[PDB]
Structure formats: C-alpha cells, structure tokens
C-alpha cells in the first residue's frame, strides 16, 4: 500500500553527468559515448544573450575553450558542432558508463524524472510532467541549466528534456536532446511567457484509479456520462479533451477496480462542479494530474530497473 | 525557482541493493563493505509469525542457507550474527561500489528519501518523513521489505531507515540499521496499531518559510503570538507542540525573509482558522508538513 510521486532510479543518469565551462559560464552537461551534450546558450555572454548569433559566436571558439570535468577528470575537447538549440562536444574518451539508451521526444502529459545537477554534480531527483503549455513546474537554482529528463524502460534509459531556462512566472522551459524546445520558447533573453495551462484529464483520472486501488472510494457514484458529455464540462473547467485513445488506456484500470473510465468520468464531473467537500484523495485536497496510466500500474505493480 | 519534494539521487545506494533468500523467502539486503544487512523476518517460516524466537530460529541456519545475489552474481556467506531486528550476513567479497557511508538513527520530523526495491532491484525513489507516531507514509508492496531511506549530505550517504512491514491503517514501519525500531513495534504480526498522527508544526513553518521566499506572501497577517498561546491553539488541530528548540532551528529562515518566527506562528494560526479560501501555497491546497527547515535551506534560493 501508499501511493507516492516516484522518479525512476537516477544511477545511470548520475554516471552520465560532467562540468562544462566556457568562459565565466559552468552549467551541466550529458556525457554519452564520446560526445558531452549541454545548451548552446553556454557560449553566450549576457549581452550575446540579448540577441545571439550563435553560428558566429561559435566560430571564434577553439576546442580549448570548453572545459570539461568529468568528476575530477578533465576531459579533452577534440571537436564541436550545434543540433538545433544543444552543443555536441566530441571528447577524446568514451565514456565507460554509457547506459544503453535513445534519445526520444515526449508528448504533453507524459511524465518523467529531473536529475537536477549543478557543477556536473546531481542534487536531486523528482518527477515531471510536461505541462499541456510545454513547461514544466520544476525546481531549480542558477547553475542547473543541462539537467536532464528521463524514463526507464526495462535497461533503456530515454533520454526526453534538457534543461534550459525559466520564465517569470517560475516554471521551466527545454528541449529535447536532439535541441528542439518544448514550447514557442526561444534561447534568448527576451520577453517570453508560459501560455494558459490546463488540466492533464487522462493523468487525474488514473489518480483517481490509483486511490481507489488504495482504499479512498468516498468519490465513486452510481452515475456514468458519455464523452461527449464529459468533454463539454472539462472544457468548462479547463481540463483537456479526454479521447478514446485516452479511454482505451485506461482500460487495464477500469477493469482491475471494475470502474469503467465514464463511471469515473462521472465521478470527476461531479467533484469539478461540487469540489470536494473537507475531503482529501491520496492525502491531497487538489486533483492530482502528474501521474499517467503507466505510472499508476507500474507503482501499483511494482515494476523494476536494474 | 519552483518548489518540489525533491529525493537524493539514488546511485549510491543502487549499487548496494542485492536479494537475500532464506528458504522460500526472498527480501532486499544493503551490501556495504563485506557485510550484508536485512530483515531478521527473512529467517520466519509461515509457522513463525506470531512469536518467532528468532535466536532459536538462527541458531539452525548454517552460511549456506543464506542465498545472497548482487546482479546476476551469488555472493558467498561465510558469517551471520543478529543485532537487534537486522541480520547481518558476512559475505566473501567487498562490495566495489560501497559509498562513503554512515548509520544514523533518526528524530520524528526528519525527512529521508526512499529507494524502493524487488528482488534486490530498484524500483523508484521517492521523499519520506518520519511521521511523529513512528510510522512512514511510504510506497511499499509485497516483497520491499529491505529496502532503505537514506539522505546525502555532502556525497557521505546517512542510512537512517530499513523497511520491515506495513501496519494494518496501510503506513510503514521499520528500524535504523542498528535494527532498533522506530518507535513501539515489533517484529511480529501479533496485532499492532500505530499511535494517532499529528501535524509537524516546524516543518509546516519551514514551507510557510519556503512560500515566501519564493515570492508568495498571501498568508501573513498583522499580529504576533507568545510560544504557548501558539501550541495551546495548534493542539487543537492536532499539530505537534513547537519547542524553544524548534523556534531556534528557524532563525536563519527567519533572517533571510524578514518574518520573526513568532509573526509566522501568527500565520499559521489563521490559516487554521480559515484554510486558504481557495488559495494555494506553493502548489498545494494543504499545508505540508514533509518539508524541514534543513530541505527548504538546501532547495531553495538564498536571495528572497
Ligand atoms: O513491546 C513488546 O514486546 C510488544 C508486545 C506486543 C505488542 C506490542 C505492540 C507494539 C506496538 C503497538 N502495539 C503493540 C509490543
Ligand atoms: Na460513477
């Protein structure tokens, strides 16, 4: 029993982590077989930051210039190159603990783990869901920038979110590891702003499943809705559409708690257009939307990584 | 900025998590150094539950009939001897992986990150409290027992809880690596019920802290209040007395964001009274109470 926000084992990622410095700037970069992976805006000063031309800053940069410690380790910088909005420095040496892994894009609503790190060294670990607007409501200090984002699949570690910068209302904004943002976000010091958030509906509804699997059963009612009904009132409250796709998911946990997802739907209309009456689910006086349908069977289930 | 339950990367103590098998039972053992360290339980038949004599028990168990796997490897024991709940079971091989490390036992409020693990593999990592009745609210399911809460301050990792069992309101409860126990349990599945849980005040002050240092300062009022008028309030909602001690461990938030610790008991006193209209603080609609004076420092900025 008990239910808690989880991150994944961060180990191979920690074995992945150096310092990358160039100039006055040290920031975080991923060190995989012979390439460290960390921010383009690494290279930028304050006032490049303003307006860079990255191609024309890069060029007056020799190998030399990027400084690379792999713990105590200086490693030796042998070529540079940019993907879109990340700095791939080739290094001399493999690194030895490369995990097996991919690089993939993830989908709003999709979670996943944050070693967040500073001078190439982890801090800490919590979980993540990419918000519906592409930002992620992170922890992190000056310093952080090129922390990552992870999923385990079996031995596969997924590499999904490079950090690069937060907006003025707090939240947080990256790319993945082929350098392309979530979001209308540039690497620039300019005006920029998260959009309107909403609701992950998919996500809230497996916590809801969750905590039914753990004994909280006080929200269950005798009714059931149709999409088409249900979506109108998520629209109402900010929620996202729920689709079929999204129903078909959750199928696995309609069936172990013999509550169908419009059952459930029904029981999430009513708390939007009632609240929750002094009531808590999971411990929680909000609907709870970073978990997803895996994420629930997985900790429900028990599911390793070695 | 921003404002988590934030865990201590777990690589550290990945590397020391093996299986430990003991008849038809299997749990997690902590391999650090030559030894290993588990449940005592591992050792209970099916016919033992209720009032194993775990001495009587050990006595009939030769090194052999200890299986210890680290990976795809066996381990080979060549000593055990109990200490306390925890069996420590000598084995034939340093781990190369051991962290620089230490056993510390832990005070009510302190926080801690779990590794859960199966079968000697890690699962997940997530941030626990000791509650003040002894208990944790963890994420446990069958056969997770041995596995550990541990924190890393400054790259030493502190082992402060090992995992035993789960209570019948579904909360946890276990040992130190000394295998004393937090608080009254025992080792058996005679009948056992935690106490009545209570509210850590400090901690609850400490994210009233954070909040404000993150930019938020919605939930402050006006007035001040003594130290007992304070707790003679805060009982009534079951929230733990705040000690002298507790006030003197806030001083340094206190410094940073201007709010004398007696003005932010005042705060919180209303927020009892009133609850948040609506409102949240850093993210949550509760008042969280996992978050130490110690967590909020090591997060959050140093600036306001
Ligand atoms: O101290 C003991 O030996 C003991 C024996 C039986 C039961 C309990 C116990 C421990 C915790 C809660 N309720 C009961 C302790
Ligand atoms: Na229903």
């Known amino acids: 029993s008990g239910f808690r926000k989880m991150a994944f084992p961060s180990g191979k990622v920690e074995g992945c982590m150096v310092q990358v410095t160039c100039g006055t700037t040290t920031l975080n970069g991923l060190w995989l077989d012979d390439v460290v992976y960390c921010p383009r805006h690494v290279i930028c000063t304050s006032e490049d930051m303003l307006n ?3 191609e024309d ?3 007056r940069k ?7 410690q792999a713990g105590n380790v200086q490693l030796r910088v042998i ?3 940019m993907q879109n909005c990340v700095l791939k420095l080739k290094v ?3 690194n030895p603990k490369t995990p097996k892994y991919k690089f993939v894009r993830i989908q709003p609503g999709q979670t996943f783990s944050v070693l967040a790190c500073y001078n190439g060294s982890p801090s800490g670990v919590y979980q993540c869901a990419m918000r519906p607007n592409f930002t992620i409501k992170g922890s992190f200090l000056n310093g952080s920038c090129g922390s990552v984002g992870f999923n385990i699949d079996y031995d596969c570690v997924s590499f999904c979110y490079m950090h690069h910068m937060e907006l003025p209302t707090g939240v947080h904004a990256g790319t993945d590891l082929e350098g392309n943002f979530y979001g209308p976000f540039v690497d620039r010091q300019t005006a920029q702003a998260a959009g309107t ?3 992950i509906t998919v996500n809230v509804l497996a916590w809801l499943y969750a905590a039914v699997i753990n004994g909280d059963r006080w929200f269950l009612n005798r009714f059931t809705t149709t999409l088409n009904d249900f979506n109108l009132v998520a629209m109402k409250y ?6 079929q796709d999204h129903v078909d998911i959750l199928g696995p946990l309609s069936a172990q708690t013999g509550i169908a997802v419009l059952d459930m739907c029904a029981s999430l209309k009513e708390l939007l257009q009632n609240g929750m009456n002094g009531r808590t689910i999971l411990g929680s006086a909000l609907l709870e939307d970073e978990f997803t349908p895996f ?12």
């Open 197 to 199: 958030d909403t609701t």
């Open 79 to 81: 070529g540079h190159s």
């Open 62 to 68: 020799s190998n030399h210039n990027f400084l690379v």
């Open 295 to 306: 994420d629930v069977v997985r900790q429900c289930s028990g599911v390793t990584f070695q």
């Open 57 to 59: 800053l890069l060029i």
């Open 92 to 94: 001399d040496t493999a």
């Open 238 to 243: 900010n929620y996202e559409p729920l689709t």
């Open 52 to 54: 860079p031309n990255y």
